[PDB]
Amino acid sequence: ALVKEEIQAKEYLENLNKELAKRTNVETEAAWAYGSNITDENEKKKNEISAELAKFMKEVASDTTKFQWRSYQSEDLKRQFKALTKLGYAALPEDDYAELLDTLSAMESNFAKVKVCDYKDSTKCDLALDPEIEEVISKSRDHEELAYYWREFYDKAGTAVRSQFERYVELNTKAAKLNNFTSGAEAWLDEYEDDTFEQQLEDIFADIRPLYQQIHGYVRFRLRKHYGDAVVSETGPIPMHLLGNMWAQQWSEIADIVSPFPEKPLVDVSAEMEKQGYTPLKMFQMGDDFFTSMNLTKLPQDFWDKSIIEKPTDGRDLVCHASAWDFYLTDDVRIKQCTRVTQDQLFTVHHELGHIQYFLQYQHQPFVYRTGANPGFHEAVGDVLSLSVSTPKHLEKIGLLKDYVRDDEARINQLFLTALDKIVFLPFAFTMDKYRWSLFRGEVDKANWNCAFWKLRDEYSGIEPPVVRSEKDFDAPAKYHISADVEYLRYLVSFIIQFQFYKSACIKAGQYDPDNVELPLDNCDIYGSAAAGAAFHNMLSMGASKPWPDALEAFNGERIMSGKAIAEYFEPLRVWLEAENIKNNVHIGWTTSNKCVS
Ligand SMILES: *[C@@H]1O[C@H](CO)[C@@H](O[C@@H]2O[C@H](CO)[C@@H](O[C@@H]3O[C@H](CO[C@H]4O[C@H](CO)[C@@H](O)[C@H](O)[C@@H]4O)[C@@H](O)[C@H](O[C@H]4O[C@H](CO[C@@H]5O[C@H](CO)[C@@H](O)[C@H](O)[C@@H]5O)[C@@H](O)[C@H](O)[C@@H]4O)[C@@H]3O)[C@H](O)[C@H]2NC(C)=O)[C@H](O)[C@H]1NC(C)=O
Ligand SMILES: O=C(N[C@@H](Cc1ccccc1)P(=O)(O)C[C@H](Cc1cc(-c2ccccc2)no1)C(=O)N[C@@H](Cc1ccc(O)cc1)C(=O)O)OCc1ccccc1
Ligand SMILES: *[C@@H]1O[C@H](CO)[C@@H](O)[C@H](O)[C@H]1NC(C)=O
Ligand SMILES: *[C@@H]1O[C@H](CO)[C@@H](O)[C@H](O)[C@H]1NC(C)=O
Ligand SMILES: [Zn+2]
């Protein structure tokens, strides 16, 4: 009978989950050691442990077939079994899997070890993306210096790993097919448990695109005044090196030159942070307080004892790209961040602690449920906090923003500043996976791989490289997530749903009322709101125990991903900006780039 078997299956899963947690802990420790300290020895060990765990998961997947799990009464038991049948890369033959792991570490270590020569001193060649090159990209307003660093970085982080990247695409596809997905794209998209999810994102992106065009237009207008028409054309894509960021994913670093009201306050608290003697530790402590102020969980002692919150000053190599780690025990959670004392880094700290909070909130769950309701939820949690941290309201409370008058013009400056990060990023994030999906699905010949990348960056974002690229270059792996094989759609989803979360949390905190000019959504601070916190607790404690619409329902009673909340946030900006572009006769739209030669 199935009644007796379903009772046995329940005990089988209970023991197996605990075993998976314990085995993954060993892999996670080895991965943590590699990322904190990149050596051939640590690579070998990371990859050998993973291979062992891969082998064990194969065995588990095979063992699921001895249970009639699809026949069971429990949706919960069925959901857990379904999770165990999904092997990912672990479906590959032993040798193929090992080759893949060597390929991935080759790519991530290459990215992490990139060094460029100083623009002004080619004897000094120890400049790393983080912090040296990123400091320049964000601060320099010398367009030739900007273009020099762009070309050096992209040549070393991108083109250098073309053949490894090709091999990864093959093995990624092979793995997906061994799981009976058409490609890696369907493998990634499976995490969202919704067969119309791509179309949903297309619909939502289409609604926000006109606002992005207006922002793009206005920024291009303002850059022309700064750099002149020789550097920036009216009708062409924006030279991406002028946008304050190596990938042009967010443009807030050039707010000083494109802000709507240059003679009104622009929030940039980096200087005050330094003046008040802030450290990385202080920044994490403040993030902690934010979470505990909402009646959420305080960081445990293991976090403080084991996290790395500053770039090491010994000679070593490591992955500085920030990350949050769950070791699947109790309270062993850590962050690795090469923290700097700046405004953007304060937001990052809160973002990462959102990951840590999710880990702590679902650690009581069975292992297979110890992850986000979908990858987007995990990325959204901390960003909901960063939105209120970013408000003048909050920055005044913590004494980082002084003598701030919030008149109508300063409001527009702050809305635009936020848009430069929140709206600008949407097309960027969409293209990161549109590109990889197209490679995974076999839609682009290998001979056209680099111009397929720049073509998407043009079509959706209206940016282009500073210099002519060709199919001799290979520019995509210059983005961390592309070198490190991290699905990027999570972030598009996060930037949409975080405003659904933020809006609802602000309403619960009494911080937003649409019909009250004193409680605007763009100045809501949820700090200290236990109502807000309760919503977070209800959602986050579920982990992946239910499909994501049930997790959203737990937060605010909604079950649909919607662009309504983000549009609602920026509606005051849209009205103002549309009128400002008309007043200044701003050209909108762009010609096709001439920057990637076939
Ligand atoms: C991805 O899709 C793949 C298909 O495209 C799929 O691969 C198939 O998985 C099947 C197992 O689910 C497998 O079916 C078995 O076939 C055996 C012999 O087939 C040979 O010939 C093939 C044709 O050329 C070769 O290609 C193969 O290499 C094979 O050598 C059968 O002997 C076998 O049977 C036994 O099992 C069934 C299943 O029983 C189930 O459970 C209970 C049993 O207790 C039943 O009561 C219940 O009703 C249910 O049926 C028994 O019914 C039967 O009595 C035997 O005991 C079985 O049918 C198939 O061979 C395989 N490949 C292909 C190409 O077809 C992958 O599994 C998919 N991957 C993932 C990750 O999902
Ligand atoms: O550590 C991660 N993820 C990190 C990436 C990563 C994935 C896999 C392995 C290693 C690392 P991140 O996105 O926190 C690491 C960071 C976060 C960040 C940066 C910023 C930020 C703020 C101001 C300026 C520039 C950046 N804000 O937040 C990240 O990857 N951010 C994205 C995009 C992003 C930008 C802004 C933002 O608000 C949110 C996201 C990027 O850098 O491209 O894992 C989370 C996790 C773990 C287990 C299960 C589910 C989820
Ligand atoms: C880095 O790992 C190596 C193993 O290759 C080890 O010998 C060394 O102790 C580690 N270095 C640091 C600074 O932790
Ligand atoms: C904190 O959480 C508890 C239960 O976890 C809840 O009952 C209580 O309302 C919360 N604290 C406050 C001040 O609301
Ligand atoms: Zn993240």
What does this structure look like?
InterPro entries: Peptidase_M2. It comes from Drosophila melanogaster. May be involved in the specific maturation or degradation of a number of bioactive peptides. May play a role in the contractions of the heart, gut and testes, and in spermatid differentiation. It is built from 24 helices and six strands. The chain has helices at about 1-35, 40-65, 75-85, 95-115, 130-140, 145-155, 160-180, 185-190, 195-225, 255-260, 270-275, 280-295, 300-305, 345-360, 375-390, 390-395, 410-420, 425-440, 450-460, 480-485, 490-510, 530-540, 550-555, 565-585, and strands spanning about 240, 325, 335, 465, 470, 595. The chain has one domain (about 1-598). Strand 2 and strand 3 (about 335) form a beta hairpin. By secondary structure, it is mainly alpha-helical. Strands 1-4 form a two-stranded parallel ribbon. A two-stranded antiparallel ribbon has the order 2-3. It has a two-stranded parallel sheet with strand order 5-6. Helix 1 packs antiparallel against helix 2 (about 40-65) and helix 22 (about 530-540) runs antiparallel to helix 23 (about 550-555). Bound molecules: a molecule of 6 linked components (NAG-NAG-BMA-MAN-BMA-MAN), ligand 3ES, 2-acetamido-2-deoxy-beta-D-glucopyranose (2 copies) and zinc ion (ZN). One 2-acetamido-2-deoxy-beta-D-glucopyranose (NAG) binds next to loops.
